[PDB]
């Protein structure tokens, strides 16, 4: 293992096949849970001059 430098990849390339009479309709689904974190306060502090 070593350190290397390169150009970043904008993501995984993927093309879509457009047409004027083609449609895709899902037949299944999954229920995934995603977390989310937000700060709401800080430690209050008072100082005497």
């Amino acid at each position: 293992q070593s350190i290397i430098a390169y150009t970043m990849s904008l993501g995984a390339e993927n093309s879509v096949a457009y047409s004027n009479n083609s449609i895709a309709i899902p037949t299944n689904f999954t229920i995934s849970v995603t977390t989310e974190i937000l700060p709401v306060s800080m430690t209050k502090t008072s100082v005497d001059c």
């Binding site: 849970v33 977390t35 974190i37 937000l38 700060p39 800080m42 430690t43 502090t45």
Partner: protein
């Protein structure tokens, strides 16, 4: 989600940061108490 929160430490970085900067400012604020600011001592009882 129980495993994701327990195994990885970078998940709670957002909450950790606000704790850190609050501790950083207080450390620097009391650190300035030891700088002379151009005088001959940093101990206010020494000059007196």
């Amino acid at each position: 989600i129980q495993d994701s929160l327990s195994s990885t430490p970078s998940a709670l970085g957002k909450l950790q940061d606000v704790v850190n900067q609050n501790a950083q400012a207080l450390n620097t604020l009391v650190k300035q108490l030891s700088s002379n600011f151009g005088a001959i001592s940093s101990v206010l009882n020494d000059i007196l």
